[PDB]
Amino acid sequence: KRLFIIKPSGFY
Amino acid sequence: SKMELPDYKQWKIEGTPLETVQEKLAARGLRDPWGRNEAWRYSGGFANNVSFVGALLKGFKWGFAAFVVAVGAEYYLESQN
Amino acid sequence: AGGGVHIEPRYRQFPQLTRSQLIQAEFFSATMWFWILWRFWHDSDAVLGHFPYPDPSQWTDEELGILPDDE
Amino acid sequence: MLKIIIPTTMLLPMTWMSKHNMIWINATVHSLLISLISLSLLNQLGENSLNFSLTFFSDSLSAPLLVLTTWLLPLMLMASQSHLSKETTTRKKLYITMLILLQLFLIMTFTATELILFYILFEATLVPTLIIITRWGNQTERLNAGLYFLFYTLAGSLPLLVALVYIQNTTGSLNFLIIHYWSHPLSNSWSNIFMWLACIMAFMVKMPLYGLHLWLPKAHVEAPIAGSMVLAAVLLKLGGYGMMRITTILNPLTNYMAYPFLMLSMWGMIMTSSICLRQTDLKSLIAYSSVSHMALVIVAIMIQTPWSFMGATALMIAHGLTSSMLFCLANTNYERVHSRTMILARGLQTLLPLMATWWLMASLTNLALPPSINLIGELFIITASFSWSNITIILMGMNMMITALYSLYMLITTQRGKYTHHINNIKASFTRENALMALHILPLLLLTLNPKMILGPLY
Amino acid sequence: GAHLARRYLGDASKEPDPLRMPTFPPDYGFPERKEREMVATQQEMNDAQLMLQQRDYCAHYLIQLLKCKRDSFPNFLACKHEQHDWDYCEHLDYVKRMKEFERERRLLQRKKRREQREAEMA
Amino acid sequence: APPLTLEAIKDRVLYVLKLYDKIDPEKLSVNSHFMKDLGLDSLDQVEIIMAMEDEFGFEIPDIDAEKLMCPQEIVDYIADKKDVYE
Amino acid sequence: SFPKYKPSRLATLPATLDPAEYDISPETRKAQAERLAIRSRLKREYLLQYNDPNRLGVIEDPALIRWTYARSANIYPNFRPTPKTSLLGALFGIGPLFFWYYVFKTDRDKKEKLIQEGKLDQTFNISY
Amino acid sequence: AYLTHQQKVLRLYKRALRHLESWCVHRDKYRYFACLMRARFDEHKNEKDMVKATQLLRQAEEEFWYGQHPQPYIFPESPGGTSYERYECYKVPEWCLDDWHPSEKAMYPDYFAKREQWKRLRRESWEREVKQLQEETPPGGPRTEALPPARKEGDLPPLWWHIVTRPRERPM
Amino acid sequence: SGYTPDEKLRLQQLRELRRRWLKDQELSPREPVLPPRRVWPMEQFWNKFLQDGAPWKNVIYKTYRHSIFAVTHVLIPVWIIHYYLKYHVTAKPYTVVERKPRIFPGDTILETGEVIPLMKEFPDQHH
Amino acid sequence: HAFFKAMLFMCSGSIIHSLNDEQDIRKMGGLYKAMPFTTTALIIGSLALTGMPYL
Amino acid sequence: LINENNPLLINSIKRLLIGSIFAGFIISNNIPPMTVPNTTMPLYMKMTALIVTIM
């Protein structure tokens, strides 16, 4: 399967 | 696959070296309550493991086979010289 | 861990193998046994000791130049 | 000379007369522009100092510090426009006025050609910093903190005033060149020691040596971010500049009287770095680290060895840039957590990944990891000290060993480890904080390629 | 070998100390002894980049080994006879070493018993 | 490692209690409370959970080990400890 | 019965060999009954502010700020000069300083002695 | 709370066997020694003198504290084990994901929509679940850290958010 | 002796919400919806070339990925190093100091031609 | 030491990862037939470490 | 879940295996003879290199 991984926003 | 769990009619204690302790407990006066657990570790392909020195000389039979042809090749080559 | 692994696990059983891992096993295990005594055949002396170690006691005093007790 | 001064002071009318919201912009523009012009002054000739007039001159020692101060000036503006946004325009303008007025004095004293002229703005830097610590400081004990910082330096500076004017009445002028050329062997007469003590204690106080250092933890912690950087990155270093300049007429008295300070400094650095190993406050820990590095320079300057001066100037700058950065690290973390305890916000790396890096080279630079300029400083000083005496390496190297433990101690306690569950206000880092942090680290490694720029006149 | 026990467990006066020998004069005990005639002068042994501990009498059987190694490249199975010749030379050098060791060893016990023989008669 | 899902757990779970000779296979139920009906002494209950411990490879804290009491509840505590939801 | 385990400040006695709780009283058990109650009294409201949706901030621990205060400021106001404090201050103060002074003084008093009579070698020492 | 004697014996039984496993290593020895270790346990089960039972467990763990393997066997995931919070550095709290930039949030629309439901649910449930707390809180503060479930229908059990929304033990 | 029915129910819902939450932690077939990606002329040429799939394409695929990796990571760096060495570093004295090439008895040199003398005959040691 | 000592680690690492990241030497046994290549690799490495002649 | 069939593990281990099998033969035969070789060992202690490990 595939499930959402949580990660701090690296966009900034 | 669905990881078919084998039907539990094969991992008993007879033959598996645990039963030696089983009668020893019977000699003491107790019945071992978990022999069928360790049975898989002493049954199937997991049984009859090689001895210690048996591990180190693994491949000797082929290693010696490569030896005899090797000396034959060089002895003939030396003879031709 | 998707379906289709060639090493599909087992429960309380001997895991399945493949011919590839066996043939890669004994060959190096055999060729290690090839190499150890192959060099033994051709380089026996170094491990054996090659040149001998002489024993000092048997050597007389003439080569050692040890003059007799009188002088 | 003038090409730096008038641009600095003419910057003051700009901030006062600028638009309501453009103050940060135009001030930052020309503060960086002033830095560029100051870098043009970085050039030096072989042996004769770059002399401009009777009032101003620069040498291979003053120039690296000059470009450092001008380089600093944008950084406080960058570091301060977060806790001063909710303030009346006049107070913001006044805050900016304090910084550039402070920075203006720094250019003046470093370029001063006369010791008294060096002296007049030597304490004049105190008035703007006193305002910064007291008014805009964010704490309660800042009031007692400002008093401790103010009185300590004055208690040491006033003997210099009596000493300095005594030189004028005895040896004519106090022009730095005229002192150096007409230097005479200071005698061992029991007055000359008090002569020696007065000419030295003033620079001792604002270069915290063990015993005369309790103002610094109270100076740094309660001061606002901009106050902490300027105080730790340049202010602890006027004392340094004075010693290289004023020790010209303290020999050979420096040879014999150096002993009490050398023992106090060498033992003090082990003690102070030990305090760093068990500091509850992040800002205090960085502050005490400054004492250890600064105390190393005390031994460096007071040995009076060519190598010792060179490593001093290397640690002169490298510590200042590093200490300013670490204070930025603590500040950038503080407002998010609104506390100063180190263990309050653990495991920050998992939340802020880039700050994990910025904290990482920051800790490595303070580690004197080669080839960072800090290593060139410490390693040069160790060799000079070792030539002076073989034993000191036991003290010297022990400091590096202690310096390792506490430096990564803040790294593990804050950055690494498990994130704190209760806190939920940690937002992704503003790119201002990120930009500022690179503004600090990047010139440091850029300096690694050219140590000769900051080695000093002894080079 | 066993002389360690003979020195420490037994008396120490009858084992020639390795830091002391030779002590008796070489001519003493050796009438008309010959000198180790060296072969490769200091020049050739020098520019061969020969290391000091190898700058010995058997070094002559080491230098041409390098020459054989030079032409042997890339083959590393050559120089077998030359290397064996070199090792055999060090054997000849080595076999002399304990010969000198027992030369001093046998002499000093001989000196001891001779001394007792020439002292107890009085 | 393929996702270990609760159907596999109970299959492996009841595999071991059925293995336990003190609990012969016929009357194993998913919610068969041990000493209430199977008569398994609580002193052996602190023993069947280490059998579970090696079965799935992890430690069961004692605070809940004494509370791990029924084969379904055995499975239930297994699932959340390894976030088994499928 | 192999010899016992004697504890130490660095290797304390484990609770498995501690005689107190193995000899409980009809009072000590009562003592360890409100221990959990106050612990819950500290845990309950903590989770309340921890699980509060409106809560956007940091749950300051009064114990934490107490520790920082007691270790930063509440020392001198509670300090009293006594022979224990006085001697320890002198021992850890002037003590090491004067000790290092003597060590460095005699070392320098030997170094200049050697070079003054030419009893030391600095043939290749130039970059001092 | 009350660490009554029977739990202590179970503590003794469980941990000693684990140490015994670390000693015998081989399964047959471990099985054999466990039964005799078991046998010497249940044989003394008839003691109306609970103090004597305590006296029997004075020398008990003292022998264990002698007989303890200096390196007991621990599965790596447990405290002391090799894989202890090894994957902690990966797990990140869910609230940090609210910070995500809208473009990042747009990359996962439906899951973020599901988050909104959870955010909505936890909002009104908080007042409901907190209201259940005071109305049934025992006098003189909480006596036991155990938390009562949701008595009525529909409402969620109090203080459910962090336990339910706890990051999974294998985050990657 | 097993949870009390209330806390058994508490763990029941705690299980139930956790299952729903863990279920809600999944992805979707479309997820993640990444944006358009800038592409260059060369890569999709390789893509359509490799679409055939037979080993004829892939054998020269690895060699090309090895080709441009050799040029831009081995061939280029050694070029600038040689230029730096040959005309900057070696332009300064005592920067690249060799060892004297060890010469052996009987070995001639090419710079001045002559062969230095052979070794004098050994004392004939044989084993 | 660069060759055989470096070996023993990922040879051990092979058993670690394959047997569910377990590093306690008391949990293996019978791996000779289970991982013939890893077992083959280790015996050569151990023999090299012991100093078996000509290798 | 015992498995080593992954080529990455197989290739990496085998790469050093052929390295470790020969290893010293190449290096010792290739490097110039640049340490002094002792020749006359009394056989009793020349076997010690093998006696102690075999013991």
Ligand SMILES: CCCCCCCCCCCCCCCCCC(=O)O[C@@H](COC(=O)CCCCCCCCCCCCCCC)COP(=O)(O)OC[C@H](O)CO
């Ligand atoms: C908080 C206390 C101070 C902190 C530490 C500061 C440094 C310690 C020493 C302070 C010295 C201050 C006075 C020095 C002024 C310049 C000294 C100088 O130039 O040297 C003169 C040294 O002469 C002095 O007498 C200087 C003062 C000596 C110290 C006594 C007074 C200062 C200490 C007490 C006042 C300050 C302490 C605080 C009091 C609340 C040379 O004159 P002379 O005596 O050689 O003149 C020729 C002839 O011999 C007759 O004059």
